[PDB]
Amino acid sequence: YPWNNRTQNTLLLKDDVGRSKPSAYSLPPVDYTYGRPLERDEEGAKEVSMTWKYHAETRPKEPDRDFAKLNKMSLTQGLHKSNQFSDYRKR
Amino acid sequence: MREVISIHVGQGGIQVGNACWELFCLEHGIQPDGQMPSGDDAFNTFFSETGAGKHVPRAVFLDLEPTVIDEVRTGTYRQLFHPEQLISGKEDAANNFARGHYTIGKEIVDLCLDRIRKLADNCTGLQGFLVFNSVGGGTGSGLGSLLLERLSVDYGKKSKLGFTIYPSPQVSTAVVEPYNSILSTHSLLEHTDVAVMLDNEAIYDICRRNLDIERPTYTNLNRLIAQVISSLTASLRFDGALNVDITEFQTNLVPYPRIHFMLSSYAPIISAEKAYHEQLSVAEITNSAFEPANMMAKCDPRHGKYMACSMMYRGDVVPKDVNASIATIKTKRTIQFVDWCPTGFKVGINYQPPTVVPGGDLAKVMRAVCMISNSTAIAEVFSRLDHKFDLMYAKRAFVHWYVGEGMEEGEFSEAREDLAALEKDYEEVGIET
Amino acid sequence: MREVISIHVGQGGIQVGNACWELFCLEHGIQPDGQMPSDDAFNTFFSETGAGKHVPRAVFLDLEPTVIDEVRTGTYRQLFHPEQLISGKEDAANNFARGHYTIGKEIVDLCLDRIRKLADNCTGLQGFLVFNSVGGGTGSGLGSLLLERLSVDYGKKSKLGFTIYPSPQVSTAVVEPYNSILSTHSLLEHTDVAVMLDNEAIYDICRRNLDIERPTYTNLNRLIAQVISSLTASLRFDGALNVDITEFQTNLVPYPRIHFMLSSYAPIISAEKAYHEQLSVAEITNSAFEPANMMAKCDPRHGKYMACSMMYRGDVVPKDVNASIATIKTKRTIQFVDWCPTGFKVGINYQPPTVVPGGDLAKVMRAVCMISNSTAIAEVFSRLDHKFDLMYAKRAFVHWYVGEGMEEGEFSEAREDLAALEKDYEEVGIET
Amino acid sequence: MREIVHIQGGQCGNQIGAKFWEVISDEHGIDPTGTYHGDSDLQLERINVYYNEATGGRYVPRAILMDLEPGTMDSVRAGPFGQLFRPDNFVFGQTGAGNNWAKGHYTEGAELIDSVLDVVRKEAEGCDCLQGFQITHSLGGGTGSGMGTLLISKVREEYPDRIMETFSVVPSPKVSDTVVEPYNATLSVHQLVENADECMVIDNEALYDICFRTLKLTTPTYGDLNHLVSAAMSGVTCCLRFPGQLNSDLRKLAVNLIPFPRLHFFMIGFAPLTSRGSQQYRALTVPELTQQMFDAKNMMCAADPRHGRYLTASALFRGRMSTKEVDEQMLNVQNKNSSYFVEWIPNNIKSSICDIPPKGLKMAVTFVGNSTAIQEMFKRVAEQFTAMFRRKAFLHWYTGEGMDEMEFTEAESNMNDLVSEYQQYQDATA
Amino acid sequence: MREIVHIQGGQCGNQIGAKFWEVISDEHGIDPTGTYHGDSDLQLERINVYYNEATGGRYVPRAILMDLEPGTMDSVRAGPFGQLFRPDNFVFGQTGAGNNWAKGHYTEGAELIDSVLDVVRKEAEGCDCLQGFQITHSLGGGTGSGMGTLLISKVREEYPDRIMETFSVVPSPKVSDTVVEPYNATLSVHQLVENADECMVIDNEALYDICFRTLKLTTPTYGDLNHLVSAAMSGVTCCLRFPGQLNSDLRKLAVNLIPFPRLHFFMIGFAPLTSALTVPELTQQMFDAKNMMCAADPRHGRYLTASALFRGRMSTKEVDEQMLNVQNKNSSYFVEWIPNNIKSSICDIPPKGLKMAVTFVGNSTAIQEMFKRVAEQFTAMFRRKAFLHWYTGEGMDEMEFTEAESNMNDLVSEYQQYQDATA
Numbered sequence A: 001y002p003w004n005n006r007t008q009n010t011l012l013l014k015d016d017v018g019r020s021k022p023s024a025y026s027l028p029p030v031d032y033t034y035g036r037p038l039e040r041d042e043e044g045a046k047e048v049s050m051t052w053k054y055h056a057e058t059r060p061k062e063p064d065r066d067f068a069k070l071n072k073m074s075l076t077q078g079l080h081k082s083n084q085f086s087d088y089r090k091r
Numbered sequence B: 001m002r003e004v005i006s007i008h009v010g011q012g013g014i015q016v017g018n019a020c021w022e023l024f025c026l027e028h029g030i031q032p033d034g035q036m037p038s039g040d041d042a043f044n045t046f047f048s049e050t051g052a053g054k055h056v057p058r059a060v061f062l063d064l065e066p067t068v069i070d071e072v073r074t075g076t077y078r079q080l081f082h083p084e085q086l087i088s089g090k091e092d093a094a095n096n097f098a099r100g101h102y103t104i105g106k107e108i109v110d111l112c113l114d115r116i117r118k119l120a121d122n123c124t125g126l127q128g129f130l131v132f133n134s135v136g137g138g139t140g141s142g143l144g145s146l147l148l149e150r151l152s153v154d155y156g157k158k159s160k161l162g163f164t165i166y167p168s169p170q171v172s173t174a175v176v177e178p179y180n181s182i183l184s185t186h187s188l189l190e191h192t193d194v195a196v197m198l199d200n201e202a203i204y205d206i207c208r209r210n211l212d213i214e215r216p217t218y219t220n221l222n223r224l225i226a227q228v229i230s231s232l233t234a235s236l237r238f239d240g241a242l243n244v245d246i247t248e249f250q251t252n253l254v255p256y257p258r259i260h261f262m263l264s265s266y267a268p269i270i271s272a273e274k275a276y277h278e279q280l281s282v283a284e285i286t287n288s289a290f291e292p293a294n295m296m297a298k299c300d301p302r303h304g305k306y307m308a309c310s311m312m313y314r315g316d317v318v319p320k321d322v323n324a325s326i327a328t329i330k331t332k333r334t335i336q337f338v339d340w341c342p343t344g345f346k347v348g349i350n351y352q353p354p355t356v357v358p359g360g361d362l363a364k365v366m367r368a369v370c371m372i373s374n375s376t377a378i379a380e381v382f383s384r385l386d387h388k389f390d391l392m393y394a395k396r397a398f399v400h401w402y403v404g405e406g407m408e409e410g411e412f413s414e415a416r417e418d419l420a421a422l423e424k425d426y427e428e429v430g431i432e433t
Numbered sequence C: 001m002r003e004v005i006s007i008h009v010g011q012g013g014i015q016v017g018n019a020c021w022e023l024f025c026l027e028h029g030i031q032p033d034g035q036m037p038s039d040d041a042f043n044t045f046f047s048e049t050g051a052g053k054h055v056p057r058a059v060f061l062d063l064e065p066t067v068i069d070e071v072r073t074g075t076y077r078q079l080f081h082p083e084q085l086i087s088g089k090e091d092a093a094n095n096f097a098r099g100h101y102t103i104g105k106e107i108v109d110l111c112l113d114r115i116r117k118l119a120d121n122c123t124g125l126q127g128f129l130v131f132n133s134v135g136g137g138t139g140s141g142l143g144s145l146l147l148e149r150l151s152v153d154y155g156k157k158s159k160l161g162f163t164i165y166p167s168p169q170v171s172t173a174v175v176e177p178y179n180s181i182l183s184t185h186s187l188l189e190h191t192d193v194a195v196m197l198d199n200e201a202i203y204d205i206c207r208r209n210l211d212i213e214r215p216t217y218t219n220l221n222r223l224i225a226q227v228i229s230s231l232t233a234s235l236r237f238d239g240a241l242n243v244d245i246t247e248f249q250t251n252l253v254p255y256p257r258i259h260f261m262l263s264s265y266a267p268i269i270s271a272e273k274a275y276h277e278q279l280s281v282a283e284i285t286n287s288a289f290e291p292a293n294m295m296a297k298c299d300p301r302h303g304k305y306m307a308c309s310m311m312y313r314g315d316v317v318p319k320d321v322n323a324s325i326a327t328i329k330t331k332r333t334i335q336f337v338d339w340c341p342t343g344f345k346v347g348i349n350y351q352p353p354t355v356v357p358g359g360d361l362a363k364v365m366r367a368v369c370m371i372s373n374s375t376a377i378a379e380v381f382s383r384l385d386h387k388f389d390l391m392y393a394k395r396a397f398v399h400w401y402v403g404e405g406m407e408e409g410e411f412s413e414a415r416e417d418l419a420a421l422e423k424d425y426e427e428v429g430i431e432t
Numbered sequence D: 001m002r003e004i005v006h007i008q009g010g011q012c013g014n015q016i017g018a019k020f021w022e023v024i025s026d027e028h029g030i031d032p033t034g035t036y037h038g039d040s041d042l043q044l045e046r047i048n049v050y051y052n053e054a055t056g057g058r059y060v061p062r063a064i065l066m067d068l069e070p071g072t073m074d075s076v077r078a079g080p081f082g083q084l085f086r087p088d089n090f091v092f093g094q095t096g097a098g099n100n101w102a103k104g105h106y107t108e109g110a111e112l113i114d115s116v117l118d119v120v121r122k123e124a125e126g127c128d129c130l131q132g133f134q135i136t137h138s139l140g141g142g143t144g145s146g147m148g149t150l151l152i153s154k155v156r157e158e159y160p161d162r163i164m165e166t167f168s169v170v171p172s173p174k175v176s177d178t179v180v181e182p183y184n185a186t187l188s189v190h191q192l193v194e195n196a197d198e199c200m201v202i203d204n205e206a207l208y209d210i211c212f213r214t215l216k217l218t219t220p221t222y223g224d225l226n227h228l229v230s231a232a233m234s235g236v237t238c239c240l241r242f243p244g245q246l247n248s249d250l251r252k253l254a255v256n257l258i259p260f261p262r263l264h265f266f267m268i269g270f271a272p273l274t275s276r277g278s279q280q281y282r283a284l285t286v287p288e289l290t291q292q293m294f295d296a297k298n299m300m301c302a303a304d305p306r307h308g309r310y311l312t313a314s315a316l317f318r319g320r321m322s323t324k325e326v327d328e329q330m331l332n333v334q335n336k337n338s339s340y341f342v343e344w345i346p347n348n349i350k351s352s353i354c355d356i357p358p359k360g361l362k363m364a365v366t367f368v369g370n371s372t373a374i375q376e377m378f379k380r381v382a383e384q385f386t387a388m389f390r391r392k393a394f395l396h397w398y399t400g401e402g403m404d405e406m407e408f409t410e411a412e413s414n415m416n417d418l419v420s421e422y423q424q425y426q427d428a429t430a
Numbered sequence E: 001m002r003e004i005v006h007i008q009g010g011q012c013g014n015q016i017g018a019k020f021w022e023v024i025s026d027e028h029g030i031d032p033t034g035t036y037h038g039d040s041d042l043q044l045e046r047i048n049v050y051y052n053e054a055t056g057g058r059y060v061p062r063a064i065l066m067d068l069e070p071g072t073m074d075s076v077r078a079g080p081f082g083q084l085f086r087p088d089n090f091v092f093g094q095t096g097a098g099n100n101w102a103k104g105h106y107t108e109g110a111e112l113i114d115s116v117l118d119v120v121r122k123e124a125e126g127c128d129c130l131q132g133f134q135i136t137h138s139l140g141g142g143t144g145s146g147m148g149t150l151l152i153s154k155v156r157e158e159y160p161d162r163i164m165e166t167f168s169v170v171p172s173p174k175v176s177d178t179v180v181e182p183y184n185a186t187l188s189v190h191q192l193v194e195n196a197d198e199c200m201v202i203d204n205e206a207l208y209d210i211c212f213r214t215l216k217l218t219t220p221t222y223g224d225l226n227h228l229v230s231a232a233m234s235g236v237t238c239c240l241r242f243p244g245q246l247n248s249d250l251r252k253l254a255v256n257l258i259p260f261p262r263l264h265f266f267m268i269g270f271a272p273l274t275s276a277l278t279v280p281e282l283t284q285q286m287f288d289a290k291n292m293m294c295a296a297d298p299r300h301g302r303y304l305t306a307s308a309l310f311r312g313r314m315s316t317k318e319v320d321e322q323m324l325n326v327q328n329k330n331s332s333y334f335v336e337w338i339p340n341n342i343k344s345s346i347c348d349i350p351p352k353g354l355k356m357a358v359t360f361v362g363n364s365t366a367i368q369e370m371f372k373r374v375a376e377q378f379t380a381m382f383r384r385k386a387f388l389h390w391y392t393g394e395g396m397d398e399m400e401f402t403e404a405e406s407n408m409n410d411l412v413s414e415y416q417q418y419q420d421a422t423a
């Protein structure tokens, strides 16, 4: 196709005539806006002082199962077999 | 309720104008057909409601040479302007100013004056005036002097804005342009509060250095000019963070009643190609605004200190972006201010992006800025032009035509002191105390 | 908040970066077109747009469009910003007189204009990097003049210079002695530091290790690009003891006059299929001091060392580093001077070096870049001086330079300049 | 009872005025429609100070907008809570001041000041018992300075027994917005100093100084600064409209701050104030409040307190505090800055406690005192007017509206004398 | 009550602190979120010694990190326990000194030191009664050293009534990390001796051996090294926070460890470190068993005096007997003219995870050699004016350079003569 000055392969063969030069990089996408937009800060000055959030406190640690007593009520109830002990611990 | 009328005179004045409305017409919405598209009332400054339907922009075109007028009325812009507003002459001045200031213009300014009052009646907040014309033309200047002279007496305290394009120091289109150049300087100095340089030589470079337009034409230059005009009218048709009124324009750019010439600069201006790999940060963009090559006037800012610069900002620009970048402007040592000016910065902010004519070379960008200021280096152009005069007059070459056209011999002599007197004014102003 | 600006000039200087940026592009992970596929590390060598791609602030200069356009027609159309690709029309043809006074200044104004435009965009400029080859006229004339302007414009700002002197015996140029000698004078008192990258020494390293019998200009480049990462690696990523640009010139120069440097790199294992090994640092460090692997044809043993700063990158622990230091000092074959009881600056980074795929390098969990300065460096200069002296005896090739405006006396000035420098090296090493 | 009316002029007056009533309203629990919606009865007791009584039980603030550019007010109406303002209080022109104090103070405003005063005199008779005035205006602009001071000149002529609070945003040299800033400031300062009884000067740059480092917000906007200044002034009369241990009205704050008849210059301060990070780690106490109070980076003026010696000190907290601890807190502080505090008078720091804090927090403070450092502002303004005065630069405009050179020399005189006398007591020894 | 603030500078100061509090943070069982989850009632009784009070029940250390290079600040934040610190207390520049001592002492410090100075009073002013300042720094690191010494000088003038404590790591020939090592160390002592009251030296090379020989860890990293000092750290202030038989405020030890005015450099050690222990096993390693973190060999001279700290429950009789036993058996590791130069104390809550431990503190006259070879290299560099121009062009002159040598030269001789003193 690029026979003479008709289509594009590289900058050398362009030969921009008349009004302007053809696009090169990738782009004229017709109305894409170039540059980093602005006017964005998130938190507002009025919002600054009024709220003043706090620590909110963390979460304590979760204690594990107590086992020594686990034998206590188990013996109190009246179960002594290994299989039964499997039954009581779940409850 | 704030509006200003537009007056067009001369070939280039009309040609530049055409781009003026094309850009404006697109922005506020009114299509070429004129019917409002399928309220805000922000366009009251440029247009006037006809009661129902389309709108009639406040325009009056004038030119003694019929070709310019004929072209507009056969194009796609026939349904916009009122047909009675196109006052056109019969015989062109043929660049013979005296033809246009003594013998021909006088028979046409009246109708120029007459429609002036009528348009004046409709308005309610008439703020100022605009003049579009050049100095290197016979017909344009002669009428150009008359409108401002006549308008000046009719109204007076009403403001005046000056946009004329002086001839380039090295390139030209006519041969006797310098005579027209100074002469228009003879009378304009007594009626204008502002004066702006638009030497076409500098405009081209912006097309090559950045626009990368290898073979630019007049059309390209006009499109940019309309951008500067529109650049100035944003603070008159929309809400801005810090508004500035036409009253605060000669407010800051005119230290003395006489010195009223300014040079304009706009930036950034990139095609689609280059801008893709840019940030367009306010720090750099304002950094570019003062670049010795971006100014629209082929003058050396480095040959003189600065006096006072007023710059307008538009887009999503944030206030903290300007001043911080503003202070760094002082830090640079290559630019030295006049002693008696502790500060020479005027700031403008608004929330409207820049508009690009479809199919043109300009490309959208969120932020843009325009620069207008008065500097002591302007004198060179008058310095260079004035000396060229003595070459013309040394043997009175071409004197045989202007004198017999109605202009007395002494007329050239008097302007010399006016131009000569103006030179000393600049030289005296810059001296430190 | 740390940035640098890249300056490449001359075909040797221009070409070297091409491998430099390709290695850099691969290292950070930026796509060839510049669009990220699928942090902030790029900020060291890249800046945001900030919605889209990234671009290196590299500036390319040359007086001939032939080299420039190939970049505009090579596999890298997109990345580099076109406005910064300032190019000339005619070359100086190894004529320092023509490349430094006739056509160079016609482009000196523009480059600095873009350089300043690049400086303001960032905020944390620590120092620039300058590349140039002395064995050329266009590079010599433009490079020296550009260096001269930079100092006056800024002053105290740091600058790093990577020169490439002609090889002792193999030369692609026939007038290199004339250009090189003059070039030394301009850069002696206008750039803070520089290193030695003689061509031949580059050739040997590939053969002895990479095992390729068909090396061309291409291979050497990846050697150049590889080196930069070792020195700059501390400027972008975490390390047990990071090191910055300022702490390379403030540590290596004994006195103001003696400011040249020398480079080394290892290990360099060829891309075979063997099981290899782990290559512990202690054994890798030994490979960094042996003269044969030395990056330049300046026998360190022929002279004496002054001060060495070593960079280890990968998974090195300081302990291995500290022990390696003494053992090197223990060997009698290397001697440190009476006035430098300690001369080691050690910098450890964490990233394993990224290997450009498809070259000759391989992936190694360890590495080292040894940068040391020794009095022996005068040997390269000594050989250069003799070459220069023989030609000028009969006034050879002088006529093609005088007529282009270069004055006649300066040849006396530079020659005495090297002799003054040559004498300076001799006195520093005198035992106390 | 014991109330004041509100008048704002120029763009500055409307922006703060638009912001000012925003802050007040949310504290009074009345919707922009003028209907009270507070949760505690305490929001009502002093509701007549700032509002009148109209039909339907709704409320309307007592404000009037004055300027020579309509766009300033129009941008206020459509904004949130903009329906509270009385349309009958709206007045405007159509000519524009061009930042010319001569045109505003001689040509147009005098022709436009009649309408305002007539409406101005309306509420003054309408209010049950006027207690004073408070006028916010910008001394660096064109329209605000003239009609603001000219309105100041007229009003005082009828109520010489009343009081007035002047909040002014004086221009500093670091940030400039106009080429005629040095001049217009001087002329206004001449009239204010002769008619203003209590005035506040606020520096925009410092307002950036407080926000950038203390607030540390990413990017402030014009919306941000207004909140702080309005917050500071809004707390000025804080104790007045609510029960407290020691009532502190505008009158009482008058007595304890102005030692000499002419020295009516002060600087205000607000706290607490800090960035988000400090929200959940810093500790809030009267000792915590006070330290921020005395910090050189807290006062909203470009003048450095370490560059002057404090004359008077009054503190306005909010909430519930133990008077004793604040007593020492103000007591001890006076001890560690003796060189920086006036020596010919002991106990130069006042304590004011009103039980009601500001909504959203439990500790807050408003700092107002007198220090000599302001002379730096006036002095730096001193030369700028002079510096460009020698060549008469940009004067042809001023002479072009019925003004001649005679008065200008007067304006320079008073300030130069004004600055010296203010400093004169700096070297005074007992 | 008797609370102590902390200030650190330089990369060594920043990194070490990030873990030191971590060691302490594990001591009182306080989460990174700052909420209390402890067990012992005595745990919360003196927390003001190191923690302030913050809304919601969170406690913030009174520590401020100062540096001229951003690498540490942003790096330290990301790690665990990096949220407790006040976000406002951070102060950082934008340049970094590049290991140029004068740069961080006269030019770079003079402009930024206001911020570090600003924060310093605010923390102190809130203290009920100042007890001391604890400062960690390195004499071999550039940026921290340049600002650290000036801070040391700045602190003393305004607060001549409080006791100051500082930490220094003086580089040694074995592990040399910067060619500019000789110059920086020499000036460091001049101001440190003039200003600093309490200084404890730690030799980096010494640390390696302890881990290799006692710890026997395969790979020693900076993280592991930092922990050892942390264990010794708390022992300095261990009793100040918990009750014991004979509490020992920082001033008591200073009173009982510093005999004279200008002998203010001490050697320290920690135990037990291992890859049922009784009291005797502690003492032997106490004065022996390579536990000293300083290159100096206390067997190479005589001891001015020493102090020992015991944590956990024990019978003081053994504490008394062992101390007496060691003095006699190791006369000549105690000079004649300081009879019974050992100080002791007891605490009832030993480290978390170890039953009985001891921290070494004994003023040893052998430390002279630390000045000696550090002095030795300095002359070699100076003799040829090697690397002299860097400091010369930044406000200093050769006149100042010599003054330190005399002060150090006079320092060694007077310190040396105390070894040969006889009664």
Ligand SMILES: Nc1nc2c(ncn2[C@@H]2O[C@H](COP(=O)(O)OP(=O)(O)OP(=O)(O)O)[C@@H](O)[C@H]2O)c(=O)[nH]1
Pocket: B009, B010, B011, B012, B015, B016, B063, B065, B092, B093, B094, B095, B134, B136, B137, B138, B139, B140, B141, B165, B167, B173, B200, B218, B219, B221, B222
């Ligand atoms: N910007 C711009 N200026 C133009 C254009 N065409 C002509 N001019 C200017 O017009 C100037 C000369 O004016 P004239 O050609 O005499 O036009 P005129 O004043 O109406 O006089 P006539 O030639 O008799 O019609 C030239 O110096 C140009 O600078 C144009 O297309 N764009």
Ligand SMILES: Nc1nc2c(ncn2[C@@H]2O[C@H](COP(=O)(O)OP(=O)(O)OP(=O)(O)O)[C@@H](O)[C@H]2O)c(=O)[nH]1
Pocket: C010, C011, C012, C015, C016, C064, C091, C092, C093, C094, C133, C134, C135, C136, C137, C138, C139, C140, C164, C165, C166, C172, C173, C199, C217, C218, C220, C221
């Ligand atoms: N390392 C390296 N050096 C190269 C390469 N190509 C050329 N050179 C160097 O270029 C030097 C020759 O200089 P010149 O031929 O004058 O190149 P120049 O400096 O750009 O000058 P001109 O050729 O006139 O444009 C040789 O000494 C080489 O060292 C390369 O691919 N790699």
Ligand SMILES: Nc1nc2c(ncn2[C@@H]2O[C@H](COP(=O)(O)OP(=O)(O)O)[C@@H](O)[C@H]2O)c(=O)[nH]1
Pocket: B241, B242, D009, D010, D011, D012, D015, D097, D099, D138, D140, D141, D142, D143, D144, D145, D169, D171, D176, D177, D204, D222, D223, D225, D226
């Ligand atoms: N804080 C703040 N200040 C403003 C704003 N707009 C204007 N100003 C200040 O007002 C000054 C401009 O005064 P101007 O409005 O022209 O005066 P006027 O024409 O007499 O009313 C500037 O120097 C700004 O400091 C705003 O939105 N916020």
Ligand SMILES: Nc1nc2c(ncn2[C@@H]2O[C@H](COP(=O)(O)OP(=O)(O)O)[C@@H](O)[C@H]2O)c(=O)[nH]1
Pocket: C240, C241, E009, E010, E011, E012, E013, E015, E067, E138, E140, E141, E142, E143, E144, E145, E171, E177, E204, E222, E223, E225, E226
């Ligand atoms: N113990 C220990 N020492 C360290 C560490 N990192 C660095 N150092 C020592 O600190 C010295 C260099 O200090 P530097 O990092 O430059 O401090 P800064 O520049 O002031 O922040 C070297 O001599 C190291 O021996 C660490 O993690 N632990």
Ligand SMILES: [Mg+2]
Pocket: B010, B011, B012, B063, B065, B137, B139, B140
């Ligand atoms: Mg025409």
